[PDB]
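Final report, results section. Input specification for complex C-07:
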Amino acid sequence: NRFTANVRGLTQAARNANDGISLAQTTEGAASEVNTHLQRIRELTVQASNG
Amino acid sequence: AAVINTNYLSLVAQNNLNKSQSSLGTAIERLSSGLRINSAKDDAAGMAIA
Amino acid sequence: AAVINTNYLSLVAQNNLNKSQSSLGTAIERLSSGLRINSAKDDAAGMAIA
Amino acid sequence: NLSSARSRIQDADYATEVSNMSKAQILQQAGTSVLAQANQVPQTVLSLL
Amino acid sequence: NLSSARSRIQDADYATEVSNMSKAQILQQAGTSVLAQANQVPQTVLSLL
Amino acid sequence: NLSSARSRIQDADYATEVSNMSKAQILQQAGTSVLAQANQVPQTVLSLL
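Structure output:
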């Protein structure tokens, strides 16, 4: 019974960890888009810094 | 794992193919028109200067 | 004992057979639909999140 | 990413579901057989009379 | 520009469509096989006699 | 469209039809077995004489 409880808990924990992986993936994708923006702002700032 | 309903790898491939196709489209438009700054969305200030 | 009116072993076998059949049924539904969480009685919060 | 999130919680893992089905079928045939042999258990009483 | 606008709405993206068709085919074949086993399930009842 | 409409009312859903055929076969074998066991019900009478 202890083993069954531990096994079910660990499988549910693996599911929770998969959810964490997916959450990190969404955050990572959003941050990548912010990065792609920041490159464009930097390039345009370099352009506009020309007098 | 062994899922059938949703294939994440297919979605990744489609998105990357879309990025490549967008780059190809911009390159083809630049070649055809001969103007790098066409459709001012590309380098908005450049088109004003031009 | 050597009683013939009732058979406890048959009843136990029937119960275990019913449990195995229920497991077979849920596995068959999960294969056929391809969705682990259908018929919300399994993982009620899972279907809400999905 | 959200579709992957949904897959992680909604889609079925065929690798384990098929094994569960196979074990269920094995248990089903075993249960039918053992239920039969349990049904011939009282016939041994119907030997002495 | 209006032809492009019609494209963004009307016509279909083959990259998604081919993948959807493949997934549907896999699902249909899996469903046929599991239905065969489902109709095989009550056969175990016709074992004890 | 009319061919599809005729299909909706005329042709047979082979999934359901095969399920019904398998079920009917199970009922046939079960019926002949239970009838066989029903035939020796009076044989118990042909013990005391």
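The radius of gyration of chain A is 22 Å. Helices of chain A lie at 2-49. This concludes the modelling results for the funded period.
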